[PDB]
Structure formats: structure tokens, C-alpha cells
Write a protein that binds this DNA or RNA. Structure first.
Ligand SMILES: Nc1ccn([C@H]2C[C@H](O)[C@@H](COP(=O)(O)OP(=O)(O)OP(=O)(O)O)O2)c(=O)n1
Length: 370
DNA sequence: AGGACCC
DNA sequence: GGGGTCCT
């Protein structure tokens, strides 16, 4: 039972959406701004030495033409993000979202259904769509090559559809599991696709220049390995299981070792509707702590609209803060049943304010949706 | 409640 | 930055 998975990854996503809004920005170098941050930027702008999450500070000093648009309000990028997922759901119901711009679809049932349709003869006419990782030779007599190519044909269709139907371009990687599809999708960008045949899996895995570059291994695990002599993928592949267990837990240990081989048994999960809704707001200090209520009235008013759009009702509220640094904090509590009726801000602002007193950034999160 | 991870 | 997810 070997799977066929596609990882769909949108190009420079926010800049795409802005570029659609204001076409006078197309092929003008564009960065998207949130506070002091240039969060993403278009390819026209990348060429000129802009990188994602560069300071607006430097970024201008590296490009003094860079046209900046404010993207602190995610309403539109969120909305467009869902249209993408929904389009892919039309291909196979089982789409998993990674952030606003990444999607996995498990294509296994679909490829098999396609193959069932073809005869002995047109099975030799099965060709690839896009790049093949590491220029690897197709062997049409290989059942796993055949499926991976049909997989790639499906990916090209998702991509044609996203562009035709939503005006959006992006990348795809096709592979036998989520880790690999995610790694191969980025090999040719922008707006290209790559299929990974199994013989080229070590090659892919070994092209990484650091364990941190593995989806799964984050800021902290990196530092944990780096502090053990482990730096390459092979270092990880060959480190002692037993010792690695003792340091990070049999839980993290045993999975990140699989990962270092290219092995990933984790299923594509159907995302469906969101588990939560939140608004954030960052600032340089707010200690007036009644103005700190106003912030909380803004976050609420907006959040309230979003749940009012959904039609599902949240049963828990959360307030999150951070104290001037020199870690975030949260207080939860249920939403009272009498006030789960969609007047409503008037009672909510108190719940949050006593939650407030029980304690740079203010944040409200609604969760436990029914 | 706070942590690790993702974008 | 401004969002999300699942686990402990
Ligand atoms: N660490 C991150 C990663 C992403 N984002 C935001 C900015 C992006 O518009 C979007 C997704 O980021 P990606 O890393 O997938 O990069 P893009 O899709 O924006 O550009 P590209 O795929 O060409 O690198 O969410 C962010 O704020 N902080």
C-alpha cells in the first residue's frame, strides 16, 4: 500500500493577492508589510535582493523603489486561501492545510481510479507532466513510476484550475508521502512542478544542508541536535537511536529519525472548517491598560463578524498577552451559554477584562467550536 | 496553561 | 508579523 500525495504551495501568496487587487503593482517590485516587517514580496522584488521577513528598515535600503502594501489584516488572504482548498477538495475530499498557502492532497484513490480506466496499450503512452526530480529515468514497467506520473498529471490539473478559476499560480511536488512531497515541490519555483521517483529519495534527502531544513525539526529541536554534534541529515540518520531517545524522548526521537531517511507514515488529514479564530495586534508598549481595553474592543468587533459568517458557535474564549521582554500568556474560560447567541460585545468585554486582570501584544481567540 | 511545530 | 495545528 504505497500512496501518491501532492503538496500544493502557492507562490509569494500575499503579494499575489495584492497584485490581483491592484494590477498596477504587477511587474512592479512588491513587498507586503506588517509592522516593521516585510513579510513576503513578489519575484520582481526578490531578484533585487529582497528576502522574506526582511526588515522594512533594510529592505528599502536594498531597494529604494520597492512598493509596499500593508498586510496586517488577513481577511482577503484568508478568504482566497479557502477558495484554493475548496478547489482542491473538488479533486479529492481529503485535503490538509499547512498555513494559508500550503495544501496536501492524498491522490492515492484517484490515481488508481484513473489507471483502472486505461487499456494495456495507452498505458505505455503515460507521460510525465513537469520536472522529474534529479532527471531520473522513467521506467514505464514500474508500477510506482506509472502512479507517480498519473499523480503529476493530476497536479498539473489542479495548477491549471487554480490559475484559470482563481487567477493564482503556484508549485506542486508529487511523491509517496507528505515529507517528500513538501521537499520536492520547492525544487523548481516559481510556478513549476516536480515529481519524485523512489530511486531519488536519498538524493533529495541528502540535498538538505541542515536538519533544521526538515519539516518537523523546528527552532528548538535543531538546537538540541546541534548541541550533540548532529548537523547533516546523515549525522541524524547515523546517530545512535538509543541516545537520541534519552535526550528528546522516544516520541520525537523515533520520528525525526524516520524523517531523516525520507520516511513519513503520517496520513493527510482532512482540515475541514477551522478549529479556532483569532485576531492579533502587536505594539511597542501599551500600559494605559484601559486603552488596553480598546484594543480588546477592536479585536472583538472583528472576530465577532467572522464567527457570525461561519454559523458554528464557539464555547470557549481566550485572552493572550506578552510582557515587555528582557513568552506569551493566556487565560481561558467558557463562553456563558446565555451569551452564545450569535448586545454580545457588551457582555464579552467584561469576561475578557477580568481575564485581563488575572495577569507588547494583545490577542483574543475563540475556540471549542460546536 | 503552556509547549512544540507549521506557514 | 499574524495567523494556524496538535500534544503535554
Ligand atoms: N514564517 C512565516 C511564513 C509565512 N508568513 C506569511 C507570509 C506569506 O505571504 C505566507 C506564506 O509564506 P511561505 O513561506 O509559504 O512563502 P510565500 O508563499 O509567501 O513565497 P514563496 O513560496 O515563493 O517563497 O504567510 C509569515 O508571516 N511568516
Amino acid at each position: 500500500s504505497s500512496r501518491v500525495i501532492v503538496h500544493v504551495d502557492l507562490d509569494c501568496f500575499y503579494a499575489q493577492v495584492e497584485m490581483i487587487s491592484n494590477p498596477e503593482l504587477k511587474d512592479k517590485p512588491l513587498g507586503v508589510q506588517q509592522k516593521y516587517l516585510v513579510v513576503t514580496c513578489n519575484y520582481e522584488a526578490r531578484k533585487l535582493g529582497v528576502k522574506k521577513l526582511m526588515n522594512v528598515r533594510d529592505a528599502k535600503e536594498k531597494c529604494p523603489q520597492l512598493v509596499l502594501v500593508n498586510g496586517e489584516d488577513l481577511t482577503r488572504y484568508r478568504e482566497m486561501s479557502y477558495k484554493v482548498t475548496e478547489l482542491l477538495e473538488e479533486f479529492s475530499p481529503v485535503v490538509e492545510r499547512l498555513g494559508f498557502d500550503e495544501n496536501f492532497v492524498d491522490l492515492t484513490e484517484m490515481v488508481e481510479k484513473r489507471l483502472q480506466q486505461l487499456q494495456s496499450d495507452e498505458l505505455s503512452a503515460v507521460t510525465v507532466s513537469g520536472h522529474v526530480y534529479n532527471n531520473q529515468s522513467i521506467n514505464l514497467l514500474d508500477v510506482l513510476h506509472i502512479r507517480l506520473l498519473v499523480g503529476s498529471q493530476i497536479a498539473a490539473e489542479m495548477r491549471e484550475a487554480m490559475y484559470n478559476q482563481l487567477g493564482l499560480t503556484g508549485c506542486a511536488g508529487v511523491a509517496s508521502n507528505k515529507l517528500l512531497a513538501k521537499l520536492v515541490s520547492g525544487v523548481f519555483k516559481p510556478n513549476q512542478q516536480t515529481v519524485l521517483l523512489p530511486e531519488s529519495c536519498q538524493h533529495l534527502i541528502h540535498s538538505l544542508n541542515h536538519i533544521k531544513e526538515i519539516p518537523g525539526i523546528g527552532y528548538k529541536t535543531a538546537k538540541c541536535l546541534e548541541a550533540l554534534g548532529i548537523n547533516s541529515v546523515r549525522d541524524l540518520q547515523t546517530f545512535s537511536p538509543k541516545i537520541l531517545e534519552k535526550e528528546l524522548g522516544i516520541s520525537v526521537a523515533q520520528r525525526i529519525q524516520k524523517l531523516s531517511f525520507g520516511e513519513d507514515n503520517s496520513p493527510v488529514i482532512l482540515s475541514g472548517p477551522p478549529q479556532s479564530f483569532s485576531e492579533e495586534d502587536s505594539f511597542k508598549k501599551c500600559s494605559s491598560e484601559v486603552e488596553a481595553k480598546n484594543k480588546i474592543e477592536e479585536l472583538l468587533a472583528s472576530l465577532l463578524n467572522r464567527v457570525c459568517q461561519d454559523g458554528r458557535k464557539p464555547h470557549t474564549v481566550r485572552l493572550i498577552i506578552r510582557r515587555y521582554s528582557s513568552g506569551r500568556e493566556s487565560r481561558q474560560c467558557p463562553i456563558p451559554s446565555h451569551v452564545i447567541q450569535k448586545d454580545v460585545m457588551t457582555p464579552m468585554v467584561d469576561i475578557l477584562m477580568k481575564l485581563f486582570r488575572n495577569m507588547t501584544l494583545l490577542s483574543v481567540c475563540f475556540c471549542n467550536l460546536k
